[PDB]
Design a protein around this nucleic acid. Structure first.
Lengths: 214, 139, 135, 214, 214, 125
RNA sequence: AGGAGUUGAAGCUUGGUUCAAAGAACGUAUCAAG
RNA sequence: ACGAGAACAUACGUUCUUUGAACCAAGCUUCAACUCC
């Protein structure tokens, strides 16, 4: 049985994830955000969401500090986000996906593009001169409908797994998702979370649905 | 895919070369401001011109169709208005705009209302700024 | 998107060309001041007209809604009244308004009460004064 | 645990911050104020608040003057605002956020727009010819409800960290926040200052709220 | 460690300052006064006070003549007001603020409005036909409570800097503050000058009130 | 914002219609540019004090001001017949009585813009 | 006995200054080598 | 009665860390509330 964790990521601030570090232009936006190049719609990679969730969730478990290699931190983290140790390997139950922006229609009704340019600088404090900085940022209020496939390997662990998943989702609400987060960007807020089956039907889907949808 | 300036056409093989020839023609014969000495355009004004181009260039590179949308062409026509305004203010800006022929370029961008024409114009202005900083910089 | 002057239309790809043709109509056949002398309008009058528009422009480009508010369109009507008054002040201003058809544009804005129509009108006024200063 | 530093920033003067990313008219504002582009509501970037607070706090600490890079502050400032020096890298305990204008209804109650235009000029000293400019600027008495996340990692250093944070806010009361500050703008003040927990409870939460509520 | 220069500007004459975005009725005042746009009650901009003080100090220092660009003033002026030359940017130790009207209650005691329309014209001397105008002018006897943040850099120059500040306070007594001041406006009187610390305690602060508030 | 059939928008259009009604088929000696300006000056002398007030209602002194300019234009109408035809073909005293029975600041600004539009469109033709 | 006529005119509408800096640039595991 | 048969180039991994769009700059310059009868 395989479950699908359906929801929406809502941007509270910028969320500057991703980009080619090549030259863009001379006086134009530098380090653009990652996009789905067929549409060139702004994108959340599943790698970013998975890595940030794994970091925060493995910091809350192993209570306090996380000073270790990611291939061996905590057994719940290992069974949730995969493993690659030599004599001890188990699969990830979660399959993250590349998230695309979904509310471009609502952003077109406001006569705004899906992305903006934030202007920054710094002040070299010995000479007190400025050094400007343009970064592309997705606008706030941008919605990102995501699907994560959950591989239900064992019935005895699924409630602890979604307790940990709701724990990681609560941890991401008080942290940033990508990019210059300590400078007022990247703040997200998960909403409309639910779990539905892929094929067939799961019997105790309700305890999962409202330990996660609460 | 080929932008017309005067009697010789510029495309994506020559705009760096044309802008280099234009900048190096601005030097060796600079502009005189009706007094004894010469006066060339400063960094800040041509960075204003480049910022005006970049305000559309930041949006055009994330577009889909090969022909530009109408709000892009609105902003291109308003760039033409702004360059015509700032050149009429100071005659040193008018000399730089006429010699490094800008208005003809942006009109012929407005004629062939395609994405590649505007990109050719934008890389032309970017190369123009680049060669102005390359020759005789005051940083 | 749409703004009518006579039977001849100006839209948002195009206002620079009618600003060309409007100012180049003011030049090459200028005003006659009930004398044999020549007279063209000064900088301060037309740019007082610009500041008259830009008292409204700073509150429209800052806003969101696709329809103009009643305070804004009230000040648009005030722009039309001030146009009539400073037309009545000087005959050179009257023929500048009549040739560079400004009452037609401001009445177009008052008819189609949309945000983008006034923004096009602001583009047209700024382009009028841009091509005034360019010549 | 993580803590949330809730509060508000009230403006006593203008506070013009930032540069659009917008076209300009030829009789209107040059350098307009930065905005949240979905709502066209004026915004304090979290980068500006973090940079000004870091500069003032690392000017008070290191008693006297500072002339060095951000990586060469003392360990209080490095541990509070992050670091990127080559081996002794420190993750930032503070996460700032983009601060939208928060009291728009109480600005509209006095029947005025959220921003103003402030007319300026400069005179040439030899020819006495003026040179006018118009800067968009937020109106005074605009309140900005902010929140800053704090990362409780070492419980024996949280006292000194919040002492330093209250020090930085009390310095930033006597200094501008951004833009044309020496010429009469940017003067802010800090009100409604408190700290709350993210999830759970911190044991000495009262000794942090008392050191900020004075 | 900052000092705050509390004071009061007392108006002897009109002092019409500023450009508004008010629509002007044609039988009414044209070019009205600048206001603090929340209540839009009358305002002295900080930039105007800084500009006049820098002008009158840069006349008396470098005694007499002045035909140079503002970055080429004397060292006292650059270290007191700021610099923008490329090699040596000086961060200004002064910080001016927008000064709102304070004694509106004192004016309502006298039962007068806070400002007044003054009638002027221009006689064309050829045909003696006039050309009228109205200007909105603040009334005399109006106070303006201000405070300027002195940023202490080194105590070897604070005495000389407040002596220059009291010199610029003296010099603005005999010259206007803004607007049509060569024709009888803008006469100010700096009354009840003082200085205080922000936090901490300046040990030689009793000498500073002697050289300033006297 | 109603104020007797003339909104915050169509005030200049009503004044243009009124002046065009004046200009063809006038009274007998048409009205000059000095009395109508005197009306403008008295109403904008009230307007300066009005627009520098703080709140959205009117004080007692302001109602005194509109009442006294009512008796002033009553006196001035009592002087000449041409200004009687001017104030009759305008809804001027109607606007003043509506300011009496409405007592709202925006109505006074609308009436001031109406009489300013009267001045402007009299000057335009 | 007060009538008219000027209700603002001209000038500048931003000037200059830095216009992405330092980091990491794949690490591992089978494969192989021993 | 195919140098063939069987075999996922796969598993693990945040485009991320540090950075005030700043600094400098009077809404000012020149004007008789006036002329005529």
């Amino acid at each position: 049985m395989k479950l699908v964790i359906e929801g929406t990521i809502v941007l509270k601030t910028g969320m500057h994830i991703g980009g080619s570090s090549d030259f863009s232009a001379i006086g134009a936006v530098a380090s653009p955000v990652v996009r789905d190049t067929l549409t060139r719609l702004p994108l959340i990679p599943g790698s970013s969401l998975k890595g940030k969730m794994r970091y925060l969730l493995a910091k809350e478990l192993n209570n306090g500090i996380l000073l270790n290699e990611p291939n061996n931190d905590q057994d719940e983290i290992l069974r949730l986000f995969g493993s690659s140790e030599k004599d001890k390997i188990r699969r990830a139950r979660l399959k993250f996906n590349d998230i695309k922006l979904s509310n471009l229609a609502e952003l077109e009704t406001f006569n705004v593009s899906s992305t903006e340019v934030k202007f920054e600088n710094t002040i070299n404090r010995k000479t007190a001169v400025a050094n400007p900085r343009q970064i592309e940022r997705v606008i706030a209020g941008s919605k990102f409908d995501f699907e994560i496939f959950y591989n239900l390997d064992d019935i005895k662990e699924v409630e602890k797994d979604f307790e940990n998943i709701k724990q990681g989702f609560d941890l991401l609400e008080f942290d940033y998702l990508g990019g210059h987060g300590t400078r007022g960007s990247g703040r997200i807020a998960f909403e409309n979370l639910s779990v539905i089956t892929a094929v067939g039907n799961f019997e105790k889907i309700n305890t999962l649905n409202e330990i996660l949808g609460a | 895919t080929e932008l017309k300036i005067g009697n010789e056409k510029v495309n994506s093989t020559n705009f760096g070369d044309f802008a280099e020839k234009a900048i190096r023609g601005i030097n060796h014969k600079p502009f005189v401001n009706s007094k004894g000495g010469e006066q060339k355009i400063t960094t800040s004004k041509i960075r204003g011109i480049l910022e005006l181009v970049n305000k559309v260039y930041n949006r055009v590179i994330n577009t889909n169709d090969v022909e530009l949308s109408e709000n892009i062409l609105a902003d291109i026509a308003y760039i033409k208005v702004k360059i015509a305004y700032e050149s009429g203010r100071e005659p040193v800006v008018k000399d730089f705009i006429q010699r490094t022929a800008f208005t003809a370029a942006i009109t012929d961008v407005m004629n062939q209302r395609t994405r590649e024409s505007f990109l050719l114009f934008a890389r032309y202005v970017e190369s123009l700024i680049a060669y102005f900083k390359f020759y005789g910089g005051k940083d």
